[PDB]
Amino acid sequence: SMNRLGIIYEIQGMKAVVLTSEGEFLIIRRRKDMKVGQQVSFENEDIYNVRGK
């Protein structure tokens, strides 16, 4: 659980755009917790960018 914090900036179906505390836009898996506008705690494991592949 490598937790990263980001604000749900936008949603792409099952993907979510998070504007992190770093000010970076990352594409993550959208969970049911993802509401547009809120800062969510996700894992790096949720990140579609930093998947590991």
PDB file of N, CA, C and O in Angstrom:
ATOM      1  N   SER A   1       0.811  -1.189   0.000  1.00  0.00           N
ATOM      2  CA  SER A   1       0.000   0.000   0.000  1.00  0.00           C
ATOM      3  C   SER A   1       0.852   1.248   0.000  1.00  0.00           C
ATOM      4  O   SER A   1       1.026   1.896   1.037  1.00  0.00           O
ATOM      5  N   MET A   2       1.421   1.584  -1.142  1.00  0.00           N
ATOM      6  CA  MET A   2       2.172   2.814  -1.237  1.00  0.00           C
ATOM      7  C   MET A   2       1.182   3.928  -1.452  1.00  0.00           C
ATOM      8  O   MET A   2       0.736   4.168  -2.567  1.00  0.00           O
ATOM      9  N   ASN A   3       0.804   4.560  -0.390  1.00  0.00           N
ATOM     10  CA  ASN A   3      -0.236   5.545  -0.433  1.00  0.00           C
ATOM     11  C   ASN A   3       0.221   6.859  -1.004  1.00  0.00           C
ATOM     12  O   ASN A   3       1.277   7.395  -0.646  1.00  0.00           O
ATOM     13  N   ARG A   4      -0.556   7.334  -1.925  1.00  0.00           N
ATOM     14  CA  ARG A   4      -0.366   8.604  -2.558  1.00  0.00           C
ATOM     15  C   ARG A   4      -1.669   9.365  -2.393  1.00  0.00           C
ATOM     16  O   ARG A   4      -2.737   8.743  -2.280  1.00  0.00           O
ATOM     17  N   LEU A   5      -1.599  10.664  -2.371  1.00  0.00           N
ATOM     18  CA  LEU A   5      -2.775  11.488  -2.165  1.00  0.00           C
ATOM     19  C   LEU A   5      -3.024  12.307  -3.391  1.00  0.00           C
ATOM     20  O   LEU A   5      -2.105  12.951  -3.903  1.00  0.00           O
ATOM     21  N   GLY A   6      -4.230  12.280  -3.876  1.00  0.00           N
ATOM     22  CA  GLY A   6      -4.551  13.077  -5.011  1.00  0.00           C
ATOM     23  C   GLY A   6      -5.989  13.418  -5.065  1.00  0.00           C
ATOM     24  O   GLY A   6      -6.820  12.717  -4.509  1.00  0.00           O
ATOM     25  N   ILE A   7      -6.274  14.478  -5.734  1.00  0.00           N
ATOM     26  CA  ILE A   7      -7.604  14.979  -5.884  1.00  0.00           C
ATOM     27  C   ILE A   7      -8.168  14.459  -7.175  1.00  0.00           C
ATOM     28  O   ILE A   7      -7.507  14.544  -8.214  1.00  0.00           O
ATOM     29  N   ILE A   8      -9.343  13.869  -7.103  1.00  0.00           N
ATOM     30  CA  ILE A   8     -10.010  13.370  -8.282  1.00  0.00           C
ATOM     31  C   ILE A   8     -10.391  14.540  -9.154  1.00  0.00           C
ATOM     32  O   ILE A   8     -11.350  15.264  -8.878  1.00  0.00           O
ATOM     33  N   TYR A   9      -9.616  14.720 -10.169  1.00  0.00           N
ATOM     34  CA  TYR A   9      -9.732  15.818 -11.072  1.00  0.00           C
ATOM     35  C   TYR A   9     -10.732  15.487 -12.166  1.00  0.00           C
ATOM     36  O   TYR A   9     -11.487  16.357 -12.622  1.00  0.00           O
ATOM     37  N   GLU A  10     -10.753  14.229 -12.568  1.00  0.00           N
ATOM     38  CA  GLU A  10     -11.600  13.786 -13.644  1.00  0.00           C
ATOM     39  C   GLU A  10     -11.735  12.265 -13.583  1.00  0.00           C
ATOM     40  O   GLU A  10     -10.935  11.598 -12.916  1.00  0.00           O
ATOM     41  N   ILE A  11     -12.727  11.730 -14.265  1.00  0.00           N
ATOM     42  CA  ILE A  11     -12.985  10.304 -14.303  1.00  0.00           C
ATOM     43  C   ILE A  11     -13.036   9.845 -15.759  1.00  0.00           C
ATOM     44  O   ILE A  11     -13.620  10.525 -16.611  1.00  0.00           O
ATOM     45  N   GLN A  12     -12.414   8.734 -16.045  1.00  0.00           N
ATOM     46  CA  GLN A  12     -12.467   8.126 -17.355  1.00  0.00           C
ATOM     47  C   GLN A  12     -12.975   6.714 -17.182  1.00  0.00           C
ATOM     48  O   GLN A  12     -12.208   5.749 -17.253  1.00  0.00           O
ATOM     49  N   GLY A  13     -14.267   6.602 -16.919  1.00  0.00           N
ATOM     50  CA  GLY A  13     -14.891   5.320 -16.663  1.00  0.00           C
ATOM     51  C   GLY A  13     -14.311   4.640 -15.431  1.00  0.00           C
ATOM     52  O   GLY A  13     -14.578   5.041 -14.300  1.00  0.00           O
ATOM     53  N   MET A  14     -13.468   3.662 -15.663  1.00  0.00           N
ATOM     54  CA  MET A  14     -12.839   2.906 -14.599  1.00  0.00           C
ATOM     55  C   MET A  14     -11.468   3.469 -14.272  1.00  0.00           C
ATOM     56  O   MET A  14     -10.703   2.878 -13.514  1.00  0.00           O
ATOM     57  N   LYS A  15     -11.155   4.600 -14.852  1.00  0.00           N
ATOM     58  CA  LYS A  15      -9.927   5.300 -14.562  1.00  0.00           C
ATOM     59  C   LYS A  15     -10.266   6.613 -13.899  1.00  0.00           C
ATOM     60  O   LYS A  15     -11.360   7.154 -14.094  1.00  0.00           O
ATOM     61  N   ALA A  16      -9.356   7.124 -13.151  1.00  0.00           N
ATOM     62  CA  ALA A  16      -9.519   8.391 -12.508  1.00  0.00           C
ATOM     63  C   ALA A  16      -8.256   9.197 -12.662  1.00  0.00           C
ATOM     64  O   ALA A  16      -7.154   8.644 -12.627  1.00  0.00           O
ATOM     65  N   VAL A  17      -8.416  10.473 -12.863  1.00  0.00           N
ATOM     66  CA  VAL A  17      -7.303  11.386 -12.963  1.00  0.00           C
ATOM     67  C   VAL A  17      -7.115  12.020 -11.612  1.00  0.00           C
ATOM     68  O   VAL A  17      -8.026  12.689 -11.105  1.00  0.00           O
ATOM     69  N   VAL A  18      -5.995  11.790 -11.016  1.00  0.00           N
ATOM     70  CA  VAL A  18      -5.712  12.368  -9.739  1.00  0.00           C
ATOM     71  C   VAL A  18      -4.670  13.432  -9.852  1.00  0.00           C
ATOM     72  O   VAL A  18      -3.619  13.229 -10.460  1.00  0.00           O
ATOM     73  N   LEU A  19      -4.985  14.564  -9.319  1.00  0.00           N
ATOM     74  CA  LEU A  19      -4.063  15.635  -9.190  1.00  0.00           C
ATOM     75  C   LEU A  19      -3.490  15.507  -7.797  1.00  0.00           C
ATOM     76  O   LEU A  19      -4.164  15.811  -6.808  1.00  0.00           O
ATOM     77  N   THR A  20      -2.304  14.995  -7.719  1.00  0.00           N
ATOM     78  CA  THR A  20      -1.690  14.657  -6.459  1.00  0.00           C
ATOM     79  C   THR A  20      -1.287  15.874  -5.634  1.00  0.00           C
ATOM     80  O   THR A  20      -1.368  17.025  -6.097  1.00  0.00           O
ATOM     81  N   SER A  21      -0.821  15.612  -4.420  1.00  0.00           N
ATOM     82  CA  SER A  21      -0.304  16.625  -3.523  1.00  0.00           C
ATOM     83  C   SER A  21       0.994  17.222  -4.078  1.00  0.00           C
ATOM     84  O   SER A  21       1.450  18.286  -3.655  1.00  0.00           O
ATOM     85  N   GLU A  22       1.564  16.518  -5.036  1.00  0.00           N
ATOM     86  CA  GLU A  22       2.750  16.921  -5.721  1.00  0.00           C
ATOM     87  C   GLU A  22       2.400  17.799  -6.910  1.00  0.00           C
ATOM     88  O   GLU A  22       3.264  18.431  -7.501  1.00  0.00           O
ATOM     89  N   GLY A  23       1.124  17.829  -7.257  1.00  0.00           N
ATOM     90  CA  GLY A  23       0.678  18.616  -8.381  1.00  0.00           C
ATOM     91  C   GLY A  23       0.872  17.902  -9.687  1.00  0.00           C
ATOM     92  O   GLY A  23       1.052  18.524 -10.731  1.00  0.00           O
ATOM     93  N   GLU A  24       0.828  16.603  -9.636  1.00  0.00           N
ATOM     94  CA  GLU A  24       1.017  15.787 -10.802  1.00  0.00           C
ATOM     95  C   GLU A  24      -0.312  15.153 -11.159  1.00  0.00           C
ATOM     96  O   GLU A  24      -1.114  14.878 -10.266  1.00  0.00           O
ATOM     97  N   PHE A  25      -0.569  14.952 -12.430  1.00  0.00           N
ATOM     98  CA  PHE A  25      -1.784  14.275 -12.838  1.00  0.00           C
ATOM     99  C   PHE A  25      -1.453  12.833 -13.165  1.00  0.00           C
ATOM    100  O   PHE A  25      -0.692  12.544 -14.108  1.00  0.00           O
ATOM    101  N   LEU A  26      -1.966  11.941 -12.384  1.00  0.00           N
ATOM    102  CA  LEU A  26      -1.743  10.532 -12.593  1.00  0.00           C
ATOM    103  C   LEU A  26      -3.049   9.858 -12.934  1.00  0.00           C
ATOM    104  O   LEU A  26      -4.116  10.323 -12.525  1.00  0.00           O
ATOM    105  N   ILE A  27      -2.971   8.799 -13.689  1.00  0.00           N
ATOM    106  CA  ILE A  27      -4.131   8.030 -14.050  1.00  0.00           C
ATOM    107  C   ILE A  27      -4.158   6.799 -13.171  1.00  0.00           C
ATOM    108  O   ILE A  27      -3.213   5.991 -13.179  1.00  0.00           O
ATOM    109  N   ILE A  28      -5.183   6.667 -12.395  1.00  0.00           N
ATOM    110  CA  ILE A  28      -5.302   5.549 -11.498  1.00  0.00           C
ATOM    111  C   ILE A  28      -6.576   4.787 -11.767  1.00  0.00           C
ATOM    112  O   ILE A  28      -7.442   5.253 -12.516  1.00  0.00           O
ATOM    113  N   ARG A  29      -6.649   3.606 -11.213  1.00  0.00           N
ATOM    114  CA  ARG A  29      -7.854   2.808 -11.224  1.00  0.00           C
ATOM    115  C   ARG A  29      -8.911   3.541 -10.430  1.00  0.00           C
ATOM    116  O   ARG A  29      -8.636   4.064  -9.342  1.00  0.00           O
ATOM    117  N   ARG A  30     -10.085   3.603 -10.947  1.00  0.00           N
ATOM    118  CA  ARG A  30     -11.144   4.220 -10.224  1.00  0.00           C
ATOM    119  C   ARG A  30     -11.841   3.191  -9.363  1.00  0.00           C
ATOM    120  O   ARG A  30     -12.297   2.156  -9.852  1.00  0.00           O
ATOM    121  N   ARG A  31     -11.883   3.453  -8.094  1.00  0.00           N
ATOM    122  CA  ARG A  31     -12.609   2.626  -7.169  1.00  0.00           C
ATOM    123  C   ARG A  31     -13.939   3.311  -6.932  1.00  0.00           C
ATOM    124  O   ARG A  31     -14.138   4.448  -7.395  1.00  0.00           O
ATOM    125  N   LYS A  32     -14.821   2.686  -6.184  1.00  0.00           N
ATOM    126  CA  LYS A  32     -16.133   3.278  -5.904  1.00  0.00           C
ATOM    127  C   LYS A  32     -16.002   4.471  -4.947  1.00  0.00           C
ATOM    128  O   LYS A  32     -16.923   5.268  -4.795  1.00  0.00           O
ATOM    129  N   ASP A  33     -14.831   4.589  -4.342  1.00  0.00           N
ATOM    130  CA  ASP A  33     -14.499   5.669  -3.405  1.00  0.00           C
ATOM    131  C   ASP A  33     -14.209   6.960  -4.150  1.00  0.00           C
ATOM    132  O   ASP A  33     -14.187   8.036  -3.563  1.00  0.00           O
ATOM    133  N   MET A  34     -13.961   6.854  -5.432  1.00  0.00           N
ATOM    134  CA  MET A  34     -13.544   7.995  -6.201  1.00  0.00           C
ATOM    135  C   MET A  34     -14.703   8.882  -6.604  1.00  0.00           C
ATOM    136  O   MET A  34     -15.513   8.523  -7.476  1.00  0.00           O
ATOM    137  N   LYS A  35     -14.779  10.017  -5.957  1.00  0.00           N
ATOM    138  CA  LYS A  35     -15.731  11.041  -6.245  1.00  0.00           C
ATOM    139  C   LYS A  35     -14.959  12.242  -6.753  1.00  0.00           C
ATOM    140  O   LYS A  35     -13.922  12.589  -6.179  1.00  0.00           O
ATOM    141  N   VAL A  36     -15.443  12.868  -7.795  1.00  0.00           N
ATOM    142  CA  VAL A  36     -14.757  13.998  -8.408  1.00  0.00           C
ATOM    143  C   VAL A  36     -14.724  15.180  -7.449  1.00  0.00           C
ATOM    144  O   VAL A  36     -15.762  15.589  -6.926  1.00  0.00           O
ATOM    145  N   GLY A  37     -13.545  15.691  -7.191  1.00  0.00           N
ATOM    146  CA  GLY A  37     -13.410  16.830  -6.331  1.00  0.00           C
ATOM    147  C   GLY A  37     -12.685  16.532  -5.039  1.00  0.00           C
ATOM    148  O   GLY A  37     -12.052  17.416  -4.476  1.00  0.00           O
ATOM    149  N   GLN A  38     -12.764  15.306  -4.559  1.00  0.00           N
ATOM    150  CA  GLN A  38     -12.146  14.985  -3.275  1.00  0.00           C
ATOM    151  C   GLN A  38     -10.732  14.436  -3.416  1.00  0.00           C
ATOM    152  O   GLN A  38     -10.372  13.843  -4.449  1.00  0.00           O
ATOM    153  N   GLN A  39      -9.938  14.665  -2.388  1.00  0.00           N
ATOM    154  CA  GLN A  39      -8.594  14.150  -2.296  1.00  0.00           C
ATOM    155  C   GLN A  39      -8.650  12.762  -1.684  1.00  0.00           C
ATOM    156  O   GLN A  39      -9.056  12.595  -0.526  1.00  0.00           O
ATOM    157  N   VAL A  40      -8.253  11.787  -2.438  1.00  0.00           N
ATOM    158  CA  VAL A  40      -8.354  10.414  -2.028  1.00  0.00           C
ATOM    159  C   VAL A  40      -6.978   9.830  -1.774  1.00  0.00           C
ATOM    160  O   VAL A  40      -5.965  10.304  -2.336  1.00  0.00           O
ATOM    161  N   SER A  41      -6.933   8.856  -0.914  1.00  0.00           N
ATOM    162  CA  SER A  41      -5.748   8.130  -0.642  1.00  0.00           C
ATOM    163  C   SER A  41      -5.784   6.839  -1.454  1.00  0.00           C
ATOM    164  O   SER A  41      -6.689   6.008  -1.283  1.00  0.00           O
ATOM    165  N   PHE A  42      -4.867   6.699  -2.356  1.00  0.00           N
ATOM    166  CA  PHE A  42      -4.794   5.522  -3.188  1.00  0.00           C
ATOM    167  C   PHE A  42      -3.442   4.894  -3.036  1.00  0.00           C
ATOM    168  O   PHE A  42      -2.592   5.419  -2.308  1.00  0.00           O
ATOM    169  N   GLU A  43      -3.236   3.793  -3.678  1.00  0.00           N
ATOM    170  CA  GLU A  43      -1.972   3.115  -3.623  1.00  0.00           C
ATOM    171  C   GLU A  43      -1.269   3.279  -4.952  1.00  0.00           C
ATOM    172  O   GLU A  43      -1.883   3.701  -5.923  1.00  0.00           O
ATOM    173  N   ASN A  44       0.004   2.950  -5.009  1.00  0.00           N
ATOM    174  CA  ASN A  44       0.751   3.054  -6.264  1.00  0.00           C
ATOM    175  C   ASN A  44       0.373   1.899  -7.126  1.00  0.00           C
ATOM    176  O   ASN A  44       0.455   1.944  -8.344  1.00  0.00           O
ATOM    177  N   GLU A  45      -0.079   0.876  -6.458  1.00  0.00           N
ATOM    178  CA  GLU A  45      -0.631  -0.293  -7.036  1.00  0.00           C
ATOM    179  C   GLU A  45      -1.923   0.042  -7.840  1.00  0.00           C
ATOM    180  O   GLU A  45      -2.307  -0.691  -8.755  1.00  0.00           O
ATOM    181  N   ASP A  46      -2.563   1.176  -7.506  1.00  0.00           N
ATOM    182  CA  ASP A  46      -3.775   1.636  -8.219  1.00  0.00           C
ATOM    183  C   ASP A  46      -3.400   2.452  -9.423  1.00  0.00           C
ATOM    184  O   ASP A  46      -4.239   2.746 -10.270  1.00  0.00           O
ATOM    185  N   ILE A  47      -2.159   2.834  -9.509  1.00  0.00           N
ATOM    186  CA  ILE A  47      -1.730   3.701 -10.554  1.00  0.00           C
ATOM    187  C   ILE A  47      -1.528   2.924 -11.839  1.00  0.00           C
ATOM    188  O   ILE A  47      -0.864   1.885 -11.870  1.00  0.00           O
ATOM    189  N   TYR A  48      -2.145   3.411 -12.881  1.00  0.00           N
ATOM    190  CA  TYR A  48      -2.045   2.815 -14.186  1.00  0.00           C
ATOM    191  C   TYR A  48      -0.739   3.239 -14.848  1.00  0.00           C
ATOM    192  O   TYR A  48      -0.221   2.554 -15.731  1.00  0.00           O
ATOM    193  N   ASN A  49      -0.234   4.394 -14.435  1.00  0.00           N
ATOM    194  CA  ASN A  49       1.062   4.898 -14.914  1.00  0.00           C
ATOM    195  C   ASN A  49       2.180   4.052 -14.350  1.00  0.00           C
ATOM    196  O   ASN A  49       2.936   3.423 -15.080  1.00  0.00           O
ATOM    197  N   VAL A  50       2.270   4.026 -13.047  1.00  0.00           N
ATOM    198  CA  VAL A  50       3.287   3.275 -12.362  1.00  0.00           C
ATOM    199  C   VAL A  50       2.729   1.917 -11.990  1.00  0.00           C
ATOM    200  O   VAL A  50       2.350   1.666 -10.854  1.00  0.00           O
ATOM    201  N   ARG A  51       2.635   1.072 -12.967  1.00  0.00           N
ATOM    202  CA  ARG A  51       2.130  -0.256 -12.770  1.00  0.00           C
ATOM    203  C   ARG A  51       3.270  -1.180 -12.401  1.00  0.00           C
ATOM    204  O   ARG A  51       3.186  -1.957 -11.441  1.00  0.00           O
ATOM    205  N   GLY A  52       4.348  -1.040 -13.122  1.00  0.00           N
ATOM    206  CA  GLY A  52       5.459  -1.947 -13.000  1.00  0.00           C
ATOM    207  C   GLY A  52       5.676  -2.644 -14.321  1.00  0.00           C
ATOM    208  O   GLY A  52       6.579  -3.470 -14.472  1.00  0.00           O
ATOM    209  N   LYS A  53       4.820  -2.304 -15.267  1.00  0.00           N
ATOM    210  CA  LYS A  53       4.834  -2.818 -16.607  1.00  0.00           C
ATOM    211  C   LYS A  53       4.236  -1.750 -17.498  1.00  0.00           C
ATOM    212  O   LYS A  53       3.023  -1.503 -17.413  1.00  0.00           O
TER     213      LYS A  53
END
